[PDB]
Write a protein that binds this ligand. Structure first.
Ligand code: HEM
Ligand code: HEM
Ligand SMILES: Cc1cc(N)nc(CCc2cc(CCCN(C)C)cc(F)c2F)c1
Ligand SMILES: Cc1cc(N)nc(CCc2cc(CCCN(C)C)cc(F)c2F)c1
Ligand SMILES: C[C@H](O)[C@H](O)[C@H]1CNc2nc(N)[nH]c(=O)c2N1
Ligand SMILES: C[C@H](O)[C@H](O)[C@H]1CNc2nc(N)[nH]c(=O)c2N1
Ligand SMILES: [Zn+2]
Lengths: 413, 408
């Protein structure tokens, strides 16, 4: 591989030079003959596999604190090596846990929000043993992160994988989501994306109120045991009713959304260790709600009903009636969040911040992996600065990875 | 491997086998993806490429292994020997042109790929000849608004010292002028090319929508200027169905999109002048041409007339104005009976095209970064379509600007 790689911005002419790609680890999925850059998703480790992964991470940690080669560096290397020899694993210091989590965010190529990567609150939950403990930890996370609408980014890290039969997992894909319900007639109440998970929850004991915006219970798995259900206290679930600054009829659609986006189905890999329950949360970019959640045809799919209330001609696609309503729906979501003093960022501000971040990373770090397909917002793409920015995608570690759905792998006791 | 692509809205899964036949590079490796990078002979390299192309041509007319096939491979081998190159048969020229379009990963319009009028211009020797051939192209493809796809193929490269090149990047574009106060009149993307036209004799009217002259290079000689007869240049005043003040913005665009800076490669041969044209997708004009900050950049003005609050971005004033600008373009071409397609129709057509290519051909190389329209992405069906990108030949490739390589 060539040592220097250039990226250009076609709107400003700015050329950046990437050397960080030389530290790439796992596979993109691409080859020199095929590019999989639009593919969404393109047993444990052995002593011999773990040794070099830990050393790589420990080296990198001591490089960052400007102690590379020090006595504390070599002593940590030897302690780690001795520990892998006697137990086939090792335990991270708190300092290394925090560094690793912040860098998995920093390295998350699909995240436009990374300007904030070093302001992450890390909750060490590695002493947790039961699903009730997991509930306690997550409740405290949600309350801290919500902060009465002054949202603060945070991660709670549960115990790492051991033999693969004792995994901690949050079975929810996100900590806060609305249920969806299949009716006998084929229609769907609530969020259609969550019909499968809702059905699991119901069979597990949950009593569904069967509304359009029912907050799902937490389904928590500790130490490989069968998952258990918990209701998040509703006063911890901050929500925003959606209204429009001009269209007084917009509130009559009964739309609302929750304030905290909190991914809980991903795996955090640090130094070869696997943290299979590591829920992390930030704050929303408006398009995640106004464009995808509300206007995807497989989701709440409100474009038609907004278009009718807007009295648009909906017989020709070339009237752009869909595009017009999409803008108005996204004006309402940003307006409703700002009026309630709940942190949100529009797609224009977040992509300008990301460009500034990317440029600083190239300056100070030698690069910034970014997945263009995910960084570019789902509306108005080319009037945001990221559209015109060339990006290199590669995988650095520590990182967040996908993992199988726990109901597909769990062995029921 | 047989690779699978999933549509995340419909859950339709297709299976790609066609990628097994690529061999040109993508630019990516297992460790670094370059999917968002815009720009990632001799007798001995030439025959295997000629062979593969003849093989796929005779396989496409279902006469693989025919005597005609055999005699063609021998005919081509002898000619590469005596002459160091070879000439395509007319049937191979047309087949190669249509398949370079069929294989263009970045083109959302490929449902039309086999309906292409091919103009053989390989007998051309002078810039006057090129001008004639180009005028006939423009007149043919424009067709009084009922646009028809077309390509004009000038002589292939011989030694690189005698290239045919259209120096315009597109046959019809508007000039751009640097103003003394620092701002730009016209199209800022064409400032330098306009300066090269002026420095060579073109007298500019110095307006906002001056059709540029043609700058044509024949057989490696210096380029010569020509004005396309104005009755050949179809233009559309832009107006809005609801906002009667929109026509007062003074906006217009040309009807015919015609790329003239690319290289057509067929069986190892290189056609450095191959102007090709189709019809516009509305967003090409309304989003990029009009609202790119480095182009006509009219968002601020439209939002002014719309009285929108332009104090904070979160009012989405740019997004509102952008939609109204794109309504006007579609309404104007439609009112003037000039072929245009909106990004909803075009992307729907492309999904259907992919479905067709997967069944009958085993895949469709496609560049998600280019296929998804520059506005309202996720409400078009291609946003949710996984695509595999790989390089099939014949193909259109980029080439250096001639003002950076031509020896005067
Ligand atoms: C603080 C403000 C943040 C903003 C504005 C932000 C923005 C975004 C957006 C818009 C996406 C795309 C999500 C989608 O389309 O489904 C995303 C993805 C992602 N973000 Fe961030 N994010 C933030 C915080 C965080 C934090 C705190 C972390 C981790 C510690 C993180 C890690 C990720 C990851 C891993 C993804 C990829 C998810 C996937 O592949 O499905 N983000 N971010
Ligand atoms: C017939 C209607 C057509 C439509 C609606 C259409 C649509 C498009 C669009 C929207 C793009 C992206 C343009 C840009 O962003 O610069 C594109 C690119 C492209 N088109 Fe098509 N096109 C059509 C016809 C054709 C024809 C006739 C050919 C060749 C014979 C062709 C070959 C290509 C190629 C090679 C590109 C990539 C250009 C580049 O990399 O700059 N297209 N097309
Ligand atoms: C930390 C953080 C900050 C921020 N702004 N956004 C995110 C993503 C939040 C999120 C993502 C998805 C995607 C589901 C999978 N997708 C393929 C459909 C669904 C949600 F309900 C949700 F809340 C995370
Ligand atoms: C056959 C065909 C059909 C169709 N619909 N569109 C096209 C593109 C036409 C086109 C493209 C560009 C891009 C310039 C480079 N870009 C990176 C800024 C500039 C133009 F003036 C122009 F006319 C071709
Ligand atoms: C097929 C395609 O990769 C898929 O639709 C992706 C495209 N880009 C995306 N970008 C974001 N931020 N989120 C998504 O869910 C997607 N979906
Ligand atoms: C950086 C990025 O590759 C560049 O902006 C691309 C993105 N996608 C595009 N898609 C189309 N159709 N046309 C373009 O000019 C571009 N520009
Ligand atoms: Zn790639």
């Amino acid at each position: 591989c060539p040592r220097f790689l250039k990226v250009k911005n076609w709107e400003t002419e700015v050329v950046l030079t990437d050397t960080l790609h030389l530290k790439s680890t796992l596979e993109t999925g691409c080859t020199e003959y095929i590019c999989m850059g639009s593919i969404m998703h393109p047993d444990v480790a052995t002593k011999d596999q773990l040794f070099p992964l830990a050393k790589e991470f420990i080296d990198q940690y001591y490089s960052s604190i400007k102690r590379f080669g020090s006595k504390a560096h070599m002593e940590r290397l030897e302690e780690v090596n001795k520990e892998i020899d006697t137990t086939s694993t090792y335990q991270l210091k708190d300092t290394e846990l925090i560094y690793g989590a912040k860098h998995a965010w920093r390295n998350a190529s699909r995240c436009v929000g990374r300007i904030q990567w070093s302001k992450l609150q890390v909750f060490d939950a590695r002493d947790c043993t039961t699903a009730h403990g997991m509930f306690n930890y997550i409740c405290n996370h949600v309350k801290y992160a919500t902060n009465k609408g002054n949202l603060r980014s945070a991660i709670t890290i549960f115990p790492q994988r051991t033999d693969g039969k004792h995994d901690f997992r949050v079975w929810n894909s996100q900590l806060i989501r609305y249920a969806g319900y299949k009716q006998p007639d084929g229609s769907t109440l609530g969020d259609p994306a969550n019909v499968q998970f809702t059905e699991i929850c119901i069979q597990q004991g949950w009593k569904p109120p069967r509304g359009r915006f029912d907050v799902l219970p937490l389904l928590l798995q500790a130490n490989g045991n069968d998952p258990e259900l918990f209701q998040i206290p509703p006063e911890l679930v901050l929500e925003v009713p959606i209204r429009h600054p001009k269209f007084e009829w917009f509130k009559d659609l009964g739309l609302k959304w929750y304030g905290l986006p909190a991914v809980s189905n991903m795996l955090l890999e640090i130094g070869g260790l696997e943290f299979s329950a590591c829920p992390f949360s930030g704050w929303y970019m408006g398009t995640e709600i106004g464009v995808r959640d509300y206007c995807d045809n497989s989701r709440y799919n409100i474009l038609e009903e907004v278009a009718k209330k807007m009295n648009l001609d909906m017989r020709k696609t070339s009237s752009l009636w869909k595009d017009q309503a999409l803008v108005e729906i996204n004006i309402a979501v940003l307006y409703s969040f700002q009026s309630d003093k709940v942190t949100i960022v529009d797609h224009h501000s977040a992509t300008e911040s990301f460009i500034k971040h990317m440029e600083n990373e190239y300056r100070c770090r030698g690069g910034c992996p970014a997945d263009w397909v995910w960084i570019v917002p789902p509306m108005s793409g080319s009037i945001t600065p990221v559209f015109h920015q060339e990006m290199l995608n590669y995988r650095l570690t520590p990182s967040f990875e996908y993992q199988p759905d726990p109901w597909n792998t769990h062995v029921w006791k």
